[PDB]
């Protein structure tokens, strides 16, 4: 569950963070994938 | 001399550190705020933003204002302005305040006071601590950190 | 969620448009782990032994002989839980500032929730990259009135038990000295036997210009940044060593291996900033909202970090 | 230091309700009101349910058992893994069980925080009222029922 | 006033080098420790800990127990210490020993003998002789390698 997946609707404010910080790493993922030192 | 003056300009300016960036005249409110903080608005009379204020009468044809003073009728501090309307925000001397102040034409720790104009000053009846140094913004105007809670017996 | 509250669902659509902490360049992918701990610390055991004396000669008959310690260690990382309130329009206020050019108070710097909310986080952000670089947190420029944290919060600058180098005030300007204190360090560097790994080299911009000059007749093709290269492929087993060059640091340069085994960053999986449900309503316009955010968890073995400081004096 | 029931060596009775509040591990206060300031502060030592002090020296200020005129507030809570103390501003005022010099308090009578910030029998510098006789917890701990409201 | 570090260590301790590791506060036992030692265990009163103890008696209710003390009192040296259960392992005055031991706040080869409080310090009744120099481990608490064999005459 992530929001990056449009399809994913968070029930409370709890499944909401938890999402954020899904994204969060999800997004760390692919910096490093994207990063050519 | 006003809280955020506007004016454009051909270029932008450009921010490098995110540090020592709220020491600007135009940083209203206080440095830490409860939400159970009272505040009150009053008409203001002069300019008294950022300075302490004290409760003014006139001839009774116009409601009562608030204009920069200190001494023995201190009431509160103003903290913010609206020049639009002419409302001072005041916070009432019943209740703690943390912010800048303007301060007298220092050091941390020194006790201080409110002059005749509502300005801070180094020392008696009200609670008034500096928590850092003078900061000089023009050639007439400095602000200091200061935390105001409540008054002093005698 | 998204059809009751209009915060949450600004927050979903504007969260893309924070960017990403600078801090990731400077570990490898292997080196960051999350830790599902919002504040509270998290403790690891260590072993190690040590003789006591030398060793005892075994002819004829003796019962006394020289022992081999035990000990331990119990390496401990605090996490703590930080907040900041800020201030915006309320949601139905914001048609009677809609300008056309903008959405806003220009005169009393108000702003709509997704871009006060945007801002700040930025702002968090880079408070959050200069705490895990150099292990403090302050938001003056002189450095003073720092937040009093908990023991064992470390950042890469102030990790104790690691190489320190000084440069002498009268030898500011020339490279030469510089490198030698660098040389010195990199030969007092313990790696032990996980050496064969990539190496981050941090510098400031003074220093970052002075790495271009020719070596020193000065040599026509190579470059100090060449010679260090070499230098520092010399103890990693000539693996990839990259350099990085940050505004934050001032005349320091900061040399560690990007290996998990000797450093690890362990931070918590709230560290980056989220959104606090409580907001503040009054009768006004004026609405107040709160973002938490985790500090800790950088973790590093003894000597492995060589920290170089440039005297200005 | 804040929590001393565990290391009870027995279990307790919880079939009474009467006399089962006077004890150090109750925090806060007796009566508490929604719009009630609290200002939270690291501190140095045991300001643990009594009046402090800001300390400034380099680090940001702290917050010490204290009293006179350099009183600030009232500590009411801790805690231990932060070091982190919970204080009501002296503009705030306040009604709870405080930490008292020694067991010749008695009701009614105005009350000061000394410079260990404990309670004692008395011009003043505070409004200080106590509404309960000192009681006796630890062989040199004792509370007192206190409404602090403001200065004199 | 703890065998083992009070503090969390803030690191991963550096497994190198294997020389010069010794020097810490919890290296409990002896340098050289034999299979034919004697050793007792015994109620500790107070944090003997690599101290002379002597033993402490009171209205008899309870056992006896030892402390820190030394001169006349000696009885023997502390050299581990339970803290769970409050035991602390002694070594007799007659079984000779040898280890690092607190020194009063030093060369090899001096002569010392133990105070009131359990330390070591330079010189009468006890034989015993360092082996060593003054190891400082904190601000006011240092060690010493150390032999005692018996009590010397006169």
Redesign the interface.
Same mark, same amino acid.
């Not at chain 4, 380099?58 to 702290?62: G, V």
């Not at chain 4, 011009?123 to 505070?126: D, P, R």
């Given at each position: 569950a992530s929001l990056l997946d449009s399809n994913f609707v968070p029930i409370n404010f709890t499944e909401f963070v938890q999402a954020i910080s899904n994204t969060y790493k999800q997004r760390r993922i692919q910096f490093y994938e994207n990063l050519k030192r | 001399l006003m809280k955020n003056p506007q004016q454009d300009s051909g270029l932008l300016s450009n921010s490098i550190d995110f540090r020592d960036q709220n020491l600007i005249f135009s940083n209203s409110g206080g440095v830490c705020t409860s939400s159970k903080d009272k505040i009150e608005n009053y008409p203001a009379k002069g300019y008294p933003y950022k300075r302490g204020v004290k409760l003014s009468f006139g001839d009774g044809t116009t409601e009562l204002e608030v204009e920069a003073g200190g001494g023995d009728d201190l009431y509160g501090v103003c903290s913010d302005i609206d020049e639009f309307s002419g409302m001072a925000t005041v916070i009432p001397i019943t209740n703690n305040f943390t912010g800048y102040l303007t301060l007298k034409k220092v050091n941390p720790g020194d006790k201080l006071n409110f002059n005749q104009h509502g300005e801070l000053e180094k020392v008696k009846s009200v609670n008034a601590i500096a928590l850092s140094k003078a900061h000089k913004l023009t050639e007439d105007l400095f602000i200091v950190l200061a935390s105001v809670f409540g008054n002093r017996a005698i | 969620l998204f059809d009751e509250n209009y915060y949450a669902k600004a927050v979903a659509n504007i969260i893309g448009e924070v960017k990403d902490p600078i801090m990731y360049k400077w570990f490898s992918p292997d080196q960051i782990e999350d830790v599902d701990l919002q504040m509270g610390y998290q403790k690891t055991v260590k072993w190690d032994a040590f003789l006591n004396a030398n060793p005892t000669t075994i002819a004829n008959e003796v019962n006394t002989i020289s022992t081999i310690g035990f000990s331990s260690e119990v390496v401990r990382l605090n996490y703590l839980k930080l907040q900041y309130k800020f201030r915006h329009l309320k949601q139905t206020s914001e048609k009677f500032y809609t300008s056309d050019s903008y959405i806003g108070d220009i005169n009393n710097n108000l702003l709509p929730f997704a871009q006060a909310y945007k801002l700040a986080s930025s702002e968090i952000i880079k408070l959050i990259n200069h705490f895990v670089l150099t292990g403090t947190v302050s938001i003056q420029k002189d450095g003073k009135n720092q937040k009093r944290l908990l023991p064992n919060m470390y950042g890469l600058l102030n990790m104790p038990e690691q190489i320190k180098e000084e440069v002498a005030s009268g030898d500011k300007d020339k490279m030469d000295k510089i490198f030698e204190k660098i040389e010195a360090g990199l030969s007092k560097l313990e790696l032990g036997d996980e050496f064969s790994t990539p190496m981050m080299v941090i510098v400031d911009p003074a220093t970052s210009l002075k790495l271009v000059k020719p070596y020193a007749a000065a040599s026509s093709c190579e470059k100090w940044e060449d010679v260090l290269i070499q230098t520092i492929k010399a103890i990693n087993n000539r693996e990839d060593v990259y350099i990085e060059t940050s505004n934050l640091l001032k005349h320091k340069i900061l040399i560690y291996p990007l290996n998990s085994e000797l450093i690890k960053f362990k931070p918590s999986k709230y560290m980056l900033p989220t959104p606090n449900e409580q907001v503040d309503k009054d009768s006004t316009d004026v609405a107040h909202s709160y973002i938490d955010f985790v500090l800790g968890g950088l973790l590093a073995t003894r000597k492995t970090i060589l920290q170089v400081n440039i005297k200005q004096s | 230091m804040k929590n001393p029931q565990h290391d009870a060596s027995l279990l307790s009775n919880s079939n009474e309700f009467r006399d089962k509040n006077v004890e150090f591990f109750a925090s806060g206060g007796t009566r508490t009101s @929604?719009?009630? @300031?609290? %200002?939270n502060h *690291?501190f140095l030592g045991y300001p643990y349910k009594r009046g402090v002090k800001?300390v #400034?020296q /380099? !680090? %940001? *200020? /702290?917050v010490e058992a204290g009293g006179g005129?350099d009183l !600030?507030?009232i500590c009411i809570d801790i805690d231990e893994?932060?070091?982190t103390a919970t204080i009501v *501003? #002296?503009? =705030?005022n306040f009604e709870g069980y405080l930490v008292a010099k020694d067991s010749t308090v008695k009701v009614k009578d105005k009350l000061i925080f000394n410079k260990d910030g404990a309670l004692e029998k008395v011009?003043?510098? #505070?409004n200080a009222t106590a509404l309960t006789d000192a009681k006796q917890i630890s062989n040199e701990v004792y509370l007192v029922k206190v409404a602090v409201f403001? =200065? @004199?």
């Open positions: - | - | - | @929604k719009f009630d @300031k609290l %200002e *690291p800001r #400034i /380099h !680090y %940001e *200020p /702290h005129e !600030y507030g893994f932060s070091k *501003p #002296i503009t =705030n011009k003043a510098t #505070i403001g =200065n @004199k």
